[PDB]
């Protein structure tokens, strides 16, 4: 069945070269453990684990967060990360995409964007 990859963390697939993404990704995990939402793997897909980095660069090329909500990009990103592309893969990756990002989307764009003199 679908289920989640045996990989709880994600910073593992990137130890050097991506200090920015490994940090945000490490925080996302520290965020899930913060509310005890799941000390185990949860935002993992069929094959590969989270792939937040590959999903972050893909979502940007996709067009944004709103595009992946009405442009049938759920099956696209699903095919980009190799998960199935059949049917349930899109619906699964859809919930996994929002589970991974969404709250993180605001924790990566809103405020994260170089404080535009934003009250600072």
From Swiss-Prot:
Tissue: Highly expressed in spleen, thymus, prostate, testis, ovary, small intestine, colon, and PBL, and at a much lower level in heart, brain, placenta, lung, liver, skeletal muscle, kidney, and pancreas.
Membrane-traversing stretches: none
Locations listed in the record: Nucleus
Disulfide bonds, paired cysteine numbers: none
Disorder: Coffin-Siris syndrome 2: A form of Coffin-Siris syndrome, a congenital multiple malformation syndrome with broad phenotypic and genetic variability. Cardinal features are intellectual disability, coarse facial features, hypertrichosis, and hypoplastic or absent fifth digit nails or phalanges. Additional features include malformations of the cardiac, gastrointestinal, genitourinary, and/or central nervous systems. Sucking/feeding difficulties, poor growth, ophthalmologic abnormalities, hearing impairment, and spinal anomalies are common findings.
Known function: Involved in transcriptional activation and repression of select genes by chromatin remodeling (alteration of DNA-nucleosome topology). Component of SWI/SNF chromatin remodeling complexes that carry out key enzymatic activities, changing chromatin structure by altering DNA-histone contacts within a nucleosome in an ATP-dependent manner. Binds DNA non-specifically. Belongs to the neural progenitors-specific chromatin remodeling complex (npBAF complex) and the neuron-specific chromatin remodeling complex (nBAF complex).
Subunit structure: Component of SWI/SNF chromatin remodeling complexes, in some of which it can be mutually exclusive with ARID1B/BAF250B. The canonical complex contains a catalytic subunit (either SMARCA4/BRG1/BAF190A or SMARCA2/BRM/BAF190B) and at least SMARCE1, ACTL6A/BAF53, SMARCC1/BAF155, SMARCC2/BAF170, and SMARCB1/SNF5/BAF47. Other subunits specific to each of the complexes may also be present permitting several possible combinations developmentally and tissue specific.
Name recorded for this polypeptide: AT-rich interactive domain-containing protein 1A
Gene name of the record: ARID1A
Stretch of the intact protein here: 1000 to 1119 of 2285
